[PDB]
Symmetry: D2
Subunit: 199 residues, 4 copies
């Protein structure tokens, strides 16, 4: 499944239909993905991940790109799930940066690469090649968002939260020059916000 | 401020009074700090941090030691407060590793003129903290403060969640050989637990 | 304000995209309003209510029809806003039943001079609402407003969560013969579901 | 089990250790039961209830005394639990007022009476007598709080959240003249608050 698909013909929810920090009132266009919807989808991703990767010890390799919300939410749901397991399930949580990756002894384990927004295919291919050099049991990729960029064909993640158009989105785990971290929803930024918070 | 102090005489809560994953029933002695209490205390820490460091650009330096929970919850509460601000205030989140040798998403040069908050789950060695602070201060931060969820008696952080006795606790953000990640409460491990999950 | 409008053409979300209790897998067609979206919308309703009725004593008259969820969530968000108020503002919560004939914790005389908010999960008959409002207004309330989570097309509430087509939905606060209470999302029941849980 | 016992020698947490609405700063003495702790305990009560009453269809008879939080939280945890059941579990939620009770066909079902704070024994005995006239499969009582009043020996609930001293507590589900509903913790009121919010 390509996840929740949001077509190019979808502008997003009018801002007055949701609760948005007052200080961002003119800095956004529409709410594209309400926070609660992100949670609901992520809860399902957690289930899909455990079903396909519960076979061996899982190592969650979270690619740090500025945010932490998606990693925390996905992992929180995963843990809540393993909480009901009849047997104690060990799990490893690592955070890396990207290219060059920053003692990876993930040998004989199921590696789950986690990203907020999937990057180019060449970057993803390179990361997959690097990880496979450690002889993991398996390697899967989960991304909250996948953008349909007009450029080359992007990577196809194993677990996808939402497939969205090529829009400049902020919020949840997508800051803009360190602004919008307090915005819980994924929203489209306005020209006003773009200028106001430009580096 | 020592934070919530838990005396050495404090036995803790009996396991039967709380919801604990069945697969850990024999691996724990009792509940020391219920998840809910951790959350409530962390929400106050958020307010204290914002009271002293709010209104300006805060850079949260989270020292990775295997857990993410405390960082996530503290940051979530901080962001919830930042939302009601009349003016949009930027905030930087950076998960770094120690050994001097800091692995961050950007040079420490960006710390100049900012309010730096170092966050940790627990501070074992005080010397390592004294060193990190010295390094940070070399870049002329506006201010530098330290927040720690726990402090084991026998460095004094600016913001402390709980001060507990020197006991072997696990849960919330203190995994044991990658076990207990699914345990939301901070509890004292049992002899059975230590041996069972020993590396 | 019609609130979030869901067109008659809107098919809804496929069941495989969300977390649904396994015992309901064959009892539903699809997810119409994800729990998270309901929460986000309700949080905005809270703000709208406080914007127009805040600052004064609000009496929330919740019309019991079998569910409590919507009342609880709306009230929780309202209370969360009331907390930041510089002055303490009292608020009364009263769960009443209709048939005229109102069963409340206190006489309607206490409604005099107060801001009355009637809350419902869904308004089936508009006449019953017109009658209730007439009764309430007889006690000279400062104002009287109505909030409803859902409005089925073919009375216009002051605060509406979602406007959906005339379909048989269950979940969140719409049980079916005491079934679906554990279903957090609002979904369309299936033919299998209707027969299986029929009274 | 008598639940979480809080002795008469316990004054409660200093207010500056937790997050309290600013407008109640001088209106309270101490935080007696942090909100998060109430949740954790209630989660366990939900488990205890299902284990002993999961045998037959359960009817939750919530005694309205002004609040709704405990009913909502207990029922939310119960539902989250029945969510993982291999078979669909039907459940009925009713709200009554008290004495005289306000079509009780709870025949052949397990009745769970729910209260925030257990009332006198004669009142509880009377309610139990009234309910048993409908020939229910069983009748159990759950109360968030039980106060050790100096008067006659109170009733002994089947499920008890916390057993507390005879202190004037407010918050969570215990309003005082409609104030403190926005206070999430159970706290001891001050003489200042008592006078300020007196009817």
């Amino acid at each position: 499944s390509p996840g929740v698909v949001i077509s190019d013909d979808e502008p997003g929810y009018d801002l007055d239909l949701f609760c948005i920090p007052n200080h961002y009132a003119e800095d956004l266009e529409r709410v594209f993905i309400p926070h609660g919807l992100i949670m609901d989808r992520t809860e399902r991703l957690a289930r899909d991940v455990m079903k396909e990767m519960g076979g061996h010890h899982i190592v969650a390799l979270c690619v740090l790109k500025g945010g932490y919300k998606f990693f925390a939410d996905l992992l929180d749901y995963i843990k809540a799930l393993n909480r009901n397991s009849d047997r104690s399930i060990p799990m490893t949580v690592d955070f890396i940066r990207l290219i060059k990756v920053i003692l990876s002894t993930l040998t004989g384990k199921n590696v789950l690469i986690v990203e907020d927004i999937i990057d180019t295919g060449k970057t993803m291919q390179t990361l997959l090649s690097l990880v496979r050099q450690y002889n993991p049991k398996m390697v899967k990729v989960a991304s909250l968002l996948v953008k349909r960029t007009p450029r080359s064909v992007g990577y196809k993640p194993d677990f996808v939260g939402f497939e969205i158009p090529d829009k400049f989105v902020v919020g949840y785990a997508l800051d803009y020059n360190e602004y919008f971290r307090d915005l819980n929803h994924v929203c489209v930024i306005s020209e006003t916000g773009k200028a106001k918070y430009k580096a």
